[PDB]
Amino acid sequence: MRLPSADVYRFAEPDSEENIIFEENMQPKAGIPIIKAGTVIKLIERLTYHMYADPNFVRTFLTTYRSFCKPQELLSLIIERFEIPEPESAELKRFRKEYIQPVQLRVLNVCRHWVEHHFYDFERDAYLLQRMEEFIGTVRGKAMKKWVESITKIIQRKKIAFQSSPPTVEWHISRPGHIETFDLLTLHPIEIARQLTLLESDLYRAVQPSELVGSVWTKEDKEINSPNLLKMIRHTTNLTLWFEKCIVETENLEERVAVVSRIIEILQVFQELNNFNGVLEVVSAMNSSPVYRLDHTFEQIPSRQKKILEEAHELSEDHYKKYLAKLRSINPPCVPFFGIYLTNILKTEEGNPEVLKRHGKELINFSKRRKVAEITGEIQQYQNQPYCLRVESDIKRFFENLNPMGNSMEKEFTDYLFNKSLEIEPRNPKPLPRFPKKYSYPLKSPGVRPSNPR
Amino acid sequence: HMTEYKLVVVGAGGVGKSALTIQLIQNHFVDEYDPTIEDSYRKQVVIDGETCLLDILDTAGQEEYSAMRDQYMRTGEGFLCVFAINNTKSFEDIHQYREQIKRVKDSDDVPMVLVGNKCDLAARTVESRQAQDLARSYGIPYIETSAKTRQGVEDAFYTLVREIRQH
Ligand SMILES: *[C@@H]1CC(=O)N(CC)C1=O
Numbered sequence: 038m039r040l041p042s043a044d045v046y047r048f049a050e051p052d053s054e055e056n057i058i059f060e061e062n063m064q065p066k067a068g069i070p071i072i073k074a075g076t077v078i079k080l081i082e083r084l085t086y087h088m089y090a091d092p093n094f095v096r097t098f099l100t101t102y103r104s105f106c107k108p109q110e111l112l113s114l115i116i117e118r119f120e121i122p123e124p125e126s127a128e129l130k131r132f133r134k135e136y137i138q139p140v141q142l143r144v145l146n147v148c149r150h151w152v153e154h155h156f157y158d159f160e161r162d163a164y165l166l167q168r169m170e171e172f173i174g175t176v177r178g179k180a181m182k183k184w185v186e187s188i189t190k191i192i193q194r195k196k197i198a199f200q201s202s203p204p205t206v207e208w209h210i211s212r213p214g215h216i217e218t219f220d221l222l223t224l225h226p227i228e229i230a231r232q233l234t235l236l237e238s239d240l241y242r243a244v245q246p247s248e249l250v251g252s253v254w255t256k257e258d259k260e261i262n263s264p265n266l267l268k269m270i271r272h273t274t275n276l277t278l279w280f281e282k283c284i285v286e287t288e289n290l291e292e293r294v295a296v297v298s299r300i301i302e303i304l305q306v307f308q309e310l311n312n313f314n315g316v317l318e319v320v321s322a323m324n325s326s327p328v329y330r331l332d333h334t335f336e337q338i339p340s341r342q343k344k345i346l347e348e349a350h351e352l353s354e355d356h357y358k359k360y361l362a363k364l365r366s367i368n369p370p371c372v373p374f375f376g377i378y379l380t381n382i383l384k385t386e387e388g389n390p391e392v393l394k395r396h397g398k399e400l401i402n403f404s405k406r407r408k409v410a411e412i413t414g415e416i417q418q419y420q421n422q423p424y425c426l427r428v429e430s431d432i433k434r435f436f437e438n439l440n441p442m443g444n445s446m447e448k449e450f451t452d453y454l455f456n457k458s459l460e461i462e463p464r465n466p467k468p469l470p471r472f473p474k475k476y477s478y479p480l481k482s483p484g485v486r487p488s489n490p491r
Numbered sequence: 492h493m494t495e496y497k498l499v500v501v502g503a504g505g506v507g508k509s510a511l512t513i514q515l516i517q518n519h520f521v522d523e524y525d526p527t528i529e530d531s532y533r534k535q536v537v538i539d540g541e542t543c544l545l546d547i548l549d550t551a552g553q554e555e556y557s558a559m560r561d562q563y564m565r566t567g568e569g570f571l572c573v574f575a576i577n578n579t580k581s582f583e584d585i586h587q588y589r590e591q592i593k594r595v596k597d598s599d600d601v602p603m604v605l606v607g608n609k610c611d612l613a614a615r616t617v618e619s620r621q622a623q624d625l626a627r628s629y630g631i632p633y634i635e636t637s638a639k640t641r642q643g644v645e646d647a648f649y650t651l652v653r654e655i656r657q658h
Contacts, residue, residue, distance in 0.1 A: 252552070254552075254555070255504050255505050255552060255554070256505060257505070267555060270555040270556055271555070273556065273558075274555070274556060274557055274558045277558035277559070278558050281558075317559075320562065321556075321558050321559045321561075321562050322558070324561055324562040324565060325558065325561045325562070326561045326591075326594045326595055329561070329565070330597070353562070354566075356529075356532055356548065376550070376552070376553040376556055376559070379552035379553055380526065380549075380550055380551060380552040380553055381526045381527055382552065383509060383551050383552035384509050384513065384524060384526035384531075384549075384551065384552070385524070385525075385526060387507060387509045387510060387513065387551075388509070388510075388513040388517070388523070388524030388526065389522070389523060389524055390522055408525070412527075447557060448587060455594065
């Protein structure tokens with residue numbers, strides 16, 4: 038098939054080792070080659086290829102392109118790709134049907150996927166949307182009309198911004214509506230875990246790939262670019278610190294044993310719910326410097342609860358080897374531990390070059406971007422399925438407003454927890470003091486089995 | 492069975508600290524890294540004629556999970572406390588990282604190395620004398636490395652292993 042001159046149409050330039058390179062394998066399900074690297078012209082040609090549609094490449098590209106191409110520049114490139122001149126008969130009719138119509142259709146599909154899945158580019162740059170609406174308004178053809186109309190309907194929707202019965206809400210000492218008595222030992226341990234799981238699942242689900250691609254949560258504008266991720270992490274830290282505070286502020290040994298034991302029961306329930314964020318919140322508190330050293334407390338914990346904690350701790354051993362296997366074997370709904378994804382995205386981005394060189398020419402390293410999009414894709418697979426649990430508004434609010442640090446800075450609060458630890462269980466050979474009881478209600482747990490049949 | 496050393500990288504986020512371990516683990520002519528595999532954090536090496544396995548924990552990206560630092564730190568026998576030579580705040584953060592490690596390990600004498608990392612062409616703000624004086628106040632070695640050239644990377648890790656062997 039005869040194409041126009043590269044002097045009048047940049048995308049007609051033939052493939053070479055200096056402008057596009059591939060991986061040895063093919064896309065598993067489609068039998069399409071895997072692009073390793075190329076110039077932006079070549080990536081844009083393959084993003085809107087005449088021979089076949091490439092939905093994986095479109096998805097990966099639109100998720101990661103901003104590291105090598107600005108939104109404004111990408112729009113210009115796809116507009117340029119669409120405006121195909123005919124070469125300088127049966128050859129022209131073939132070119133119209135086998136090159137122009139397929140390429141034009143592919144750029145409309147890119148526009149559609151762009152506005153549908155990455156509308157934040159348009160929210161952040163009103164002029165980008167002006168150029169998109171204008172471009173789309175100039176598209177003529179009965180073949181294109183249907184796709185054009187759909188893009189317009191998505192833009193208007195984006196501008197204007199299912200199960201059976203859940204289990205019964207569990208109550209212990211605090212009664213419904215008595216928020217003033219709510220605390221670690223007064224709320225039912227099953228319901229603490231459920232409401233934290235609901236909160237933590239919503240926080241996980243709100244994190245978008247725009248908060249992760251480019252390692253933006255580690256950069257100076259992290260508060261602007263990754264607000265949902267940072268909120269999720271800050272809640273997690275907050276709960277770990279609250280668990281540690283509950284423990285070290287219970288000076289009486291018997292009551293502290295009851296506190297630690299209740300936290301291990303919350304952990305057991307997190308494991309039942311596949312709330313791995315919750316599991317690791319607890320494990321982190323138990324391995325903290327102030328808690329870890331409380332041997333007199335851990336000696337009195339029932340053997341079964343010691344074993345529950347040990348198994349949870351083992352999930353993190355050997356660079357999360359057991360956690361990673363268990364998450365692969367799960368079974369949504371679940372709340373994954375986000376930190377592993379963060380480390381994998383950062384090390385993928387920092388550990389691989391942005392550009393590859395071939396015959397003295399710079400090619401965008403697309404495989405690096407593919408690896409990041411695979412991680413973000415794995416995050417997204419766990420964000421679709423909700424939990425079949427009822428929200429309890431007051432318990433929810435109690436966990437949202439927890440603030441164990443108060444007005445203190447991190448070091449100050451952390452030193453205070455450690456000094457409380459040394460006070461309640463002095464460093465050997467100092468004798469173990471006794472302390473008065475602080476809880477006027479019973480310490481006995483109701484256990485982690487529901488109270489009524491579902 | 493050859494000796495295995497569990498090393499932990501600690502330091503401020505946002506300043507390219509991950510380059511230290513990545514450069515160590517990747518073959519010197521392989522500009523490539525996949526953190527999602529076991530080989531990504533383990534390396535068999537020979538130090539002073541004795542073959543050993545280095546297991547390196549670098550949680551770069553997880554700095555906001557500040558209540559998980561003790562958990563991660565307690566897995567290590569030896570520590571690389573890393574700062575960026577172009578970021579004074581990262582250097583000023585070292586003191587509290589070292590205090591946490593000592594508290595976690597319950598020891599005033601933990602095998603540790605101070606590492607100053609040069610990872611871009613931004614101006615140096617931490618002079619080698621400032622870092623040498625800090626390392627001497629703690630009684631630990633100071634190693635400077637480059638992310639661009641791999642200079643000092645091996646020396647940083649091998650020095651830590653010598654600190655563990657001589658503990
Ligand atoms: C070296 C120092 C710095 O701030 N960076 C960016 C993350 C480096 O790579």
